[PDB]
Amino acid sequence: ARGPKKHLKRVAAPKHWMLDKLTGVFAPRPSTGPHKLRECLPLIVFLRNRLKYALTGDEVKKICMQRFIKIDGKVRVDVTYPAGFMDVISIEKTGEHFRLVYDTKGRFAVHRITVEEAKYKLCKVRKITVGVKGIPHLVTHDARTIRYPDPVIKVNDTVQIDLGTGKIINFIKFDTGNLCMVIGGANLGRVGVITNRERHPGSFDVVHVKDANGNSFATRLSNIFVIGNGNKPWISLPRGKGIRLTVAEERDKRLAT
Amino acid sequence: GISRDNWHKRRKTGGKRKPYHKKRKYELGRPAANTKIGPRRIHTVRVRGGNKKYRALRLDVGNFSWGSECCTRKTRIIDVVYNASNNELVRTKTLVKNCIVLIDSTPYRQWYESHYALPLGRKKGAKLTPEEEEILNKKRSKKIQKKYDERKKNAKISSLLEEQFQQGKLLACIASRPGQCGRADGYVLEGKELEFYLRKIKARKGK
């Protein structure tokens, strides 16, 4: 059409938002933010559809400008502000520190963490460059551009970030033996140790990963998030290791209840 | 309503393509501005995206870079010779991206005197122009340093550039687009390109 799109349909909505068909016609379209439309989750969906805090969206629109809900330290005035993977959601009154990790089904799974871990945050480097007066800049996939990062940071790394100061700490290199978590594709939410990377000159490379009890998968570089350091995850992940066993094993779990 | 589009063209074979667009906005075409050699006159052009484009309708001053010795001074534009694409634009005197400008060699003479002393182009008189040619007297060892610059490096600007400086004009190639940035920025023809364009202009004047 002409210019950018502005609405979004419930039928054309992505699957991982858990929207209905009978409820409404238009879907909540997230605003422009640090994450794309296919890898985000709106705050109106987080507060209305998932956690059952408000029945309508107007109550969420009222409270987000009543200045309670903040993302990563600062308060968001937008009812449809986009979030992403590995974010800290805290609201100011009780112990409610929700981590947006991925479920085995691929959904945004809630994870109430303690304040000492909620102070910290991991983030993946998107790219690295140099700029004005020859200083190094680092672009994060969470749209964080930081200057003078470190000299020992590869492009595909995961560095811990402090939300109170805006400072990076404790980088880890992309090496065989690191615990990663797949964020995109048909196998998202898959947690496994990086086993073998295979390079290809056609601008895309593949990575075979393995995990516990004898399982292996493969994915692409644009969907890998390093979460651990030698089978030691920096962030505690809910519901076991986040392993997809089998649909029949899920049925056995439901029969075991 | 100038359309630089490609949907009104023929295919690989030559089959006539059926028109269905209406020459939309994202394929603008603006008319050409023949850049004359009058005074400095540059108008503005709005660009898609909020940018500004400086359309030079006619220009007087210019910026040109000497090639070998790595110097650059201001230079008045004199004459347009040998467009090498459209010879009608030579007579029209239109400044384009690849054209030849006659540099007035006077703003290079001060730098050549100040760094490359005992200059040339002084009509073989050796009496005229009390410029500060010999007033500063070159007291310290920078006289010896200028002797290294003048005799050890030897400062050869041999017979082609010699005759050009003794005729008082220099042949320059433009290196920028005058209709886009409003600047007639270019460089000085040197060596192989110098003798090539000199041969072309000499043939154009001869036959």
Partner: protein
Amino acid sequence: TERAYQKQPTIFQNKKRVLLGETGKEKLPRYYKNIGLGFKTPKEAIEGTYIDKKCPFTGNVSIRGRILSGVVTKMKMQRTIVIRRDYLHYIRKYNRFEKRHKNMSVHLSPCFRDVQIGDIVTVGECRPLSKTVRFNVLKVTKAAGTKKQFQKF
């Protein structure tokens, strides 16, 4: 030599060599670009004479995207040739194939001599050079028969 109005890609010519006075060799100031991709730069681009704006080893033509292969058919077009890609098409109803081919024009760099008709050539995607030329000749593989034999006169 040159038969155009100007041929000088990037390299500045004069190194102000007039210090004693000598002609010397002039083929040393030549721009040398490696395309990468595990493909060897030929020696014609090293010790050649040509100047080409649209050469992948000389000009600013970046090689990206897809890599395909074809067979050279014609030569009469200047500094660019026409290839043919024979392929089959699986059909779901009748459950067998059919021959289809689509001729494309491709930019033949003048460094690749012995470009005789019938050889398997490799092409690569680049930026659009002209209206019909989009690929670029990348590696000449086949000798197009036996070059050892010779005929009468």
